[PDB]
Structure 1
Amino acid sequence: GSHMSSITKRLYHPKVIEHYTHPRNVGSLDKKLPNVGTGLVGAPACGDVMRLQIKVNDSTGVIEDVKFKTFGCGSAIASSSYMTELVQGMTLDDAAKIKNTEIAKELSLPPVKLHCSMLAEDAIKAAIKDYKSKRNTPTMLS
Structure 2
Amino acid sequence: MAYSEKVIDHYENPRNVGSLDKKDSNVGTGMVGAPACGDVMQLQIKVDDNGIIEDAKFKTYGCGSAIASSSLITEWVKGKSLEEAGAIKNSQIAEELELPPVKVHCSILAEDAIKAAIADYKAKQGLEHHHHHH
TM-score range normalised by the length of the shorter chain: 0.5 to 0.7
**Paired residue for 1:131?**
121
Alignment match of 2:44 (pick from 53, 75, 97): 53
List structure 1 segments (4+ residues) > 6 angstroms apart after TM superposition: none
Alignment match of 1:95 (pick from 85, 102, 126): 85
Q: Percent identity?
A: 61
**Paired residue for 2:30?**
39
Q: 1:64 aligns to what SS in structure 2?
A: strand
- Once the two structures are TM-superposed, the CA of residue 134 in structure 1 deviates from its matched residue by 1.0
- Once the two structures are TM-superposed, the CA of residue 35 in structure 1 deviates from its matched residue by 7.8
> AA paired with 1:116?
H
**Paired residue for 1:25?**
none
> Does the Cα contact within 8 Å between 2:94 and 2:104 map onto a contact in 1?
no
Unaligned runs of 5+ in 2: 1-16, 23-28, 130-134
Q: Greater shift after overlay, 40-49 or 127-136?
A: 40-49
Q: Greater shift after overlay, 99-108 or 126-135?
A: 99-108
**Paired residue for 1:116?**
105
> Does the Cα contact within 8 Å between 1:47 and 1:71 map onto a contact in 2?
no
Structure richer in strand, relative to its length: 2
> Does the Cα contact within 8 Å between 2:38 and 2:63 map onto a contact in 1?
no
Is 1:66 the equivalent of 2:56?
Answer: yes
Alignment RMSD, CA only? 2.8
> Does the Cα contact within 8 Å between 1:39 and 1:52 map onto a contact in 2?
yes
- From the superposition, tell whether residues 74 and 43 of structure 1 become closer, same or farther in structure 2 (CA, over 3 Å): closer
Q: Measure, in 2, the Cα distance between the counterparts of 1:138 and 1:107.
A: 38
Is 1:105 the equivalent of 2:81?
Answer: no
Unaligned runs of 5+ in 1: 1-33
Q: 2:96 aligns to what SS in structure 1?
A: helix
Residues 95-129 of structure 1: CA deviation (Å, up to 9, x unaligned): 21242123312332x65665523311112211110
> AA paired with 2:106?
S
- From the superposition, tell whether residues 60 and 124 of structure 1 become closer, same or farther in structure 2 (CA, over 3 Å): same
- From the superposition, tell whether residues 129 and 138 of structure 1 become closer, same or farther in structure 2 (CA, over 3 Å): farther
